[PDB]
Amino acid sequence: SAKILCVLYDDPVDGYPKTYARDDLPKIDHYPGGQTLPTPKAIDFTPGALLGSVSGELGLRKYLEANGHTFVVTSDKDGPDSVFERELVDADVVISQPFWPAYLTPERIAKAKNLKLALTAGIGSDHVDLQSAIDRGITVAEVTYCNSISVAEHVVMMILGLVRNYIPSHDWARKGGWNIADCVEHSYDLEGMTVGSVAAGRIGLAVLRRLAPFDVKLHYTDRHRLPEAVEKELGLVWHDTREDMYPHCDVVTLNVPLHPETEHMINDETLKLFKRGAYIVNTARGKLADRDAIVRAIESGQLAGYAGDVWFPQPAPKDHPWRTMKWEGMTPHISGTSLSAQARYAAGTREILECFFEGRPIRDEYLIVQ
């Protein structure tokens, strides 16, 4: 009855795996704060499978095709002559992940005569023009909270790796070296350091909770201030402005969206507020940081480390300078598409498709516009 158009990233270069490292995933009832994890009526995958690549199909093909539907899955999403744009003109449902996002521009939404549901397998909607969606009666939905914890682990990983000098030290072991002084001449303990978070939110609070037993001093800024009880339980020190926070911090982690007042918020002028040898971890948006200002800060020693999984442009060009600068701890944009996060937003994708196709309401927390 319906045509479903689903954009996913490519399979591994060796091919889609047949077996995985483990047999299942740890059970979890809820997210911090009580939101229950996705609750489809069933799933047709084993949790832990690769669901976000083209062959994983978010485990939706059996359920969709048993019910008469057409299911189109592709990674060709860019430009007007992509499989996505061409297939889009009679698609009823569009599904993509933020890690390989199918943009629903105003022009593309106007091309899509049949579009009814725009589904983010993942979190957020800024690949969708919401006004155009509202004007066309298109519902936009997301699997809220599905990877906030995944990102938060990635951050703490990266903070430890930068402070302790993990990546270069590992390079000496893999290369057949030893070179103890070479490893540790840039290696510190995190204990006693001051970590500052720009924005709490789901990711920022999870990061702070996870840093707390490392005996760091915890500072943060946000637009609104955490409840007094949360601040006292975690020893949080509040700042009205990030510029007031920066001079206190050995580590600064960024958790804000990209807006006109956050674009290039880390630049040559604001980096002068940071302690010599400060560390920055950025899992939010690549353009929070002036690309070349970061390179210059690493080169001068204003920063002793930079790490994150977001770039600009994204995907990063092959010669993007953050790839090979000193004291980098980068990964590709992956933190929110760990296999654990995939199981949850695949499950949430199916749950929304079920509510949608059966005419039942979609969870309020999932709905962006309707």
Add this chain to the structure above:
Amino acid sequence: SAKILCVLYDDPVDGYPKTYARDDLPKIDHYPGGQTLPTPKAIDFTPGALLGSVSGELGLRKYLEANGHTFVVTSDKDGPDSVFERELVDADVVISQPFWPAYLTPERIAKAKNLKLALTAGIGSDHVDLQSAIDRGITVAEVTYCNSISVAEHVVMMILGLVRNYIPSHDWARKGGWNIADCVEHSYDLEGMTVGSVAAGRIGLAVLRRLAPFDVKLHYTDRHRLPEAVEKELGLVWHDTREDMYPHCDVVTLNVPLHPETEHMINDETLKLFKRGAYIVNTARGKLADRDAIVRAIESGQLAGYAGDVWFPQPAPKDHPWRTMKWEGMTPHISGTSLSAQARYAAGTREILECFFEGRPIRDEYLIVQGG
């Protein structure tokens, strides 16, 4: 009137640093449990300096030479014709680190005609034959707790690195790729897994404490059970034996010393007790794990990852199989010699020498063998 012989590791291959990444170190009041940090009357370094290499000299030379002493610093420590063994003959004090250890065998101790104090700039005395020092009246001392937290951070770092597939994902980024599916085909969240610790002394307990806000389940075993209040604060599950613990664990961190009964305690037979796709982190001793048994379990998928900073043999030979095996997260032996830890055991080394040379008692908690 004293000769202090000090073995340290080589300087970095691009020279002793003139500039450091940062100007200072965080102040730390005490260790968990209440032990005070080292209390030398003075230090002649700025904390954060590279102290454990030949040119750092643990910041000791000005202090020793101003007091009429002879201070010999070398990295040449192995073999009968090395600088260490040739200078040992009349050394009053021997100082080395476990990261480049000057071995005080019975033979060398028999040849060290004036040896009164064997000082570990670090923790332990594995490289010192204690019966020979006891027989000879030689004081053996260490800088207790100086890097227990440093090891604990390295463990949690490495658990997160293994589970989330950090090292291959960073490789994709550094080589100019992107390859999201290649990164995440072996990437998981830690959240909700079961982590088991073999022993819960200073390191293991500090690991368990740092793991708790990751919402993992925390199991442990030890020769001596933790106090009930400690178990209840962290919700620890106690196991009578290592073998009772392994089947429950997604991640196993080894924090036990090397002994006859722990040697090769991870082996082809006990690995069959682990869950398929378990992860092992080992910052304790390389020979806790049968070298090739771990490689076989990686190739089998019995383990989804192995990481640590200790090796057998140590230093690891160029073609040590853990260097290039799949899903490895290794570093050289470095966790307990971060610059922060260096500052503390350099400070503690000076504190001990000051007590020693002034004929004042050395801290009980520093003494492995009292001597005189």
